[PDB]
Amino acid sequence: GEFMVSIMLLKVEDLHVYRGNREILKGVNLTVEENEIHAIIGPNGAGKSTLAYTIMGISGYKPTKGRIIFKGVDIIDKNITERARMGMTLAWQEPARFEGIKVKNYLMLGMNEKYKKDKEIAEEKIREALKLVNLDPDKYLDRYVDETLSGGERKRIELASIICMEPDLAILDEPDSGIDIVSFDEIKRVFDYLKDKGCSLLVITHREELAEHADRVSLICAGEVIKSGDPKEVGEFYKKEC
Amino acid sequence: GEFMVSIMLLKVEDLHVYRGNREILKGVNLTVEENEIHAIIGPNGAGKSTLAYTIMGISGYKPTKGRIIFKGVDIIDKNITERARMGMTLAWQEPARFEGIKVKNYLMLGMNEKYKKDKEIAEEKIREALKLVNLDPDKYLDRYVDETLSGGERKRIELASIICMEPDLAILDEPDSGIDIVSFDEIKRVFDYLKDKGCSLLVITHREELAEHADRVSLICAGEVIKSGDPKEVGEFYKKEC
Amino acid sequence: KGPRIIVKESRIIDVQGDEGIILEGKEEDGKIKAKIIVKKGYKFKYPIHMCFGITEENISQIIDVEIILEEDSSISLMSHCSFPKGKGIKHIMNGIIKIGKNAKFSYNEFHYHGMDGDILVKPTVKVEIDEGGIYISNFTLTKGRIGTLDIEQEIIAKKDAIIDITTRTYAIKEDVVKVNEVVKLNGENAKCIIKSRGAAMDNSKISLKLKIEGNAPYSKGHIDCAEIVKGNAEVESIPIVVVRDDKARITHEAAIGSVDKKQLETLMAKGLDEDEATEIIVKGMIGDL
Amino acid sequence: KGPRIIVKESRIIDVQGDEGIILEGKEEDGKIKAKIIVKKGYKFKYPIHMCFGITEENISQIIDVEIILEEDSSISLMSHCSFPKGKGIKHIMNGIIKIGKNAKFSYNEFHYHGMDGDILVKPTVKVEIDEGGIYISNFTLTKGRIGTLDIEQEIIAKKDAIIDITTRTYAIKEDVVKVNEVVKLNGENAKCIIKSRGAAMDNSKISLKLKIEGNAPYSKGHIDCAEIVKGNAEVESIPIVVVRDDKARITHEAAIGSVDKKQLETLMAKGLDEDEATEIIVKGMIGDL
């Protein structure tokens, strides 16, 4: 209902999303609070990606029943651009390749107003973001975000984009996949940096080990939130009950 | 030299592999012993994939200096087929899709003579291999190993193939990537099963958490084996010194 | 025992049609004139048959057929060709298919030939699809010598139509395969896929011209072509894409020549030799496995 | 101050060639006859220039050039065209390029035009590549109105040759873009890539015919075509693949029509509107971004 909504950034109420004849999300009740790293775990086919695309307003992910409230506003009639302008962003699992867009210009797209305006401060933010994702800024600034990059380079540049954007809500679809991750300390270093800045992360993942580093974890099984709360408790339940 | 070679399955001696003008492997000294899960860790561009392809005899991965001895035989003039007939196999990171080959027929290719020998045993091994990788045998046996499958389904079928084959040496390039892994208990269940059967696994990985479950770990940095020994020992060194 | 059209040699053997499926047939000027009419609302789950047998030398099996599907109807036609003698055979089919509003037609033709390549299989199919219509077409010629295959199709699609056209061939000796298919997406949101799979060996000659025109907003199309070349076989792949709307999008992908190196090397890592591995790939490609 | 060939209007302004790079030039029958000869062993790291300026009305800048590169030589040619007035202009280049054993030639042509489209840019390039030779070609026309672009190229390659041909275009108003390139991989292990990138707006007409013939063992090729359609623009993509060897392999991929939905939606998730996001994609496509 209306209980504790004043400290809630995102509120998904009994959401039903259909993909063709199949109902993928069968009543999703999920909330994201301010300054929280809330992870979403679940098996293949549970609706993890569908949920992330429905919140962002991606075409073809329209709810049949339910509502998505972001910042107190029901975003039912808002498009991707309008939802992004409210402080919500999505990092896809396989970030799109773009013909002829340099890294230095790509990282300026959607950049936070606190960096975006001053040029020498915006250019410094790019360096800090590329250095956080273990990429040499001078080796990548003039590279294109095209097919030429490795999947790990392109996904690290996408992680740097989330850093430059510094959103109120960052939806991260499988952030540790395809980056050639050395250890969870690499991704935790980025997660804690965004958290300290005031961001909330909606980390979508199938890897229980990644979810344990989050503040809260929700287990989605067949389009429904089965258990939610403590990361280690709901995590151990996920590994056991599948 | 010749010390402890009688219990060694694989012996890579000062191996130099060139890919174009660049020398990728700059003197690799690595050994794989009988009944051992020997993991190889290293950053991107260290030569992990190149090493796995050079041992298997993949075209375009020819050594300039050094030798690869498998089962006491120097396999310098042996092709992929000839190396596979000696008990060595490779599971690629992105297993190839095939037009019109069913799962039930794909899992019979290269299957161990202990099971291939009898129809009832071969059909039983195909069910336990698919059940071990958490796939419903009846839901996948008549599916094609083509583009239609998800990356996770195709890579789980590839792990099932390694099980059916039961090689003396199984080279596994990034076995926990692209499978939608719930936890390391899923991959360890498969690793222990192969180990109990007498297989040696040459697990190639960039993820330190995965290498911790192996018996021995070798750190490859810029085509050379820097540290080798205990999993937490060399694993922690890799996270710090990179 | 089923709505079927049997043609042995150049003569009609049987012409039987059930309730809601009018099957007419006659012989005029050396050709067979068939007319299939699926009545409005009739959705048949059992496939209609059309058997063509040729055992005599120098037979010219010419069939002009018109298939009409009325609004909300559904039918599947399974054409079977058995030409084992193959000395002077000529199977020619000229078809006019009209798929009504929200109707669904599926066509599957399978050929079984002998080792004589004096066969000419020549289908020409004109297809007109109304708002919401569906057309699924499959031609398979992987048994015996093809001889000379000459397929020509032209499909005109209106709003919300769905087209799926496929060809699986196995060309050997001096076989000639000619495929010319055009799909015009002339209505909003009309979708199409043209797929070609096959293997060409010995002195075979393959020409695959596959075309999609995205002429309306939200029309989408994809051409997928894959052809293995073995021996002295020659292949030509001409996949045309025309776009006349800024909200239309068509893609194509093709791979022609030797088997994919990763596929070959993956099977060789299982202990199969290069010839066993290639044979597996080719058999899967032609639908044998 | 550099081996360059300057042509203002239909006249040669300058003809200077350095040591090991013979640059000849004369005017005969209304055409310019140039001849560039790169001497055996000479690998020049600095690019040769070729400027073409046209400010007069009704100019027919016809240039017949022959470029010969001897064994183990290397050169890069940077042709620049400035046609700002654009009324009745006609730039025609007919070139014969002969790349010797282990020689390397690179050609880059950039155009800067005004807003009137009475320009005809017509390059015809015949390229013969010997064992181990390299040919790199780039035509960019993304500034002002193209007018009518008519590119024709035919490349014949021997053992171990490498070919890389690219085209970047930005067609507006009633612009016509015609591209016809054929690459014949006639020697063992000869490799090729033909790439086309571009955006077509308003009432432009694009025709891209790109062809690769894999005629020898171990020859490999790839055709990559991507073209954005905006407004009432019309595009035709004809990418032909011919394979005449069982150890040859050629692939092709193309995407024609509206911008990729994932690319558009990824930029809109950054706060850009559909028009800003499309503008970014199109600018990157044409090499502006």
Author numbering:
A (entry chain A), B (entry chain C): -2 to 239
C (entry chain D), D (entry chain B): 28 to 316
The authors write:
The present study focuses on the ancestor SMS from the hyperthermophilic archaeon Methanocaldococcus jannaschii. Biochemical and structural studies showed that SMS is made of a SmsC2B2 heterotetratmer wherein the SmsC subunit hosts both ATP and [Fe-S] cluster binding sites. With respect to the six components of the SUF system, SMS has only two components, SmsC and SmsB, encoded by the smsCB operon. The SmsC subunit, consisting of a RecA-like domain and a helical domain, contains all the structural motifs of the nucleotide-binding (NBD) subunits of the ABC ATPases (i.e., Walker A, Walker B, ABC signature, D-, Q-, and H-loops).
For the [Fe-S] cluster-bound structure, we chemically reconstituted the protein complex and performed crystallization inside the anoxic chamber yielding new crystal forms. Unfortunately, colorless crystals and further iron quantitation showed that the crystallized SmsC2B2 complex had no bound [Fe-S] cluster, but a sulfate anion bound to SmsC. The structure derived from crystals grown in anoxic conditions showed that the nucleotide has been displaced from the ATPase active site by a sulfate anion located into the usual site for the γ-phosphate of ATP. SmsB and SmsC assembled into a symmetric hetero-tetramer consisting of two subunits of each protein related by a 2-fold symmetry. The first N-terminal 32 residues of SmsB are disordered and were not included in the final model. However, we observed a weak extra electron density in the different maps, consistent with an α-helix likely belonging to this N-terminal region close to the center of the complex. Upon dissociation of the cluster, the C-terminal extension of SmsC unfolds, destabilizing the asymmetric SmsC-SmsC dimer observed in the cryo-EM structure, and allowing the SmsC2B2 complex to open up to adopt a conformation like the one observed in the crystal structure (intermediate 2).
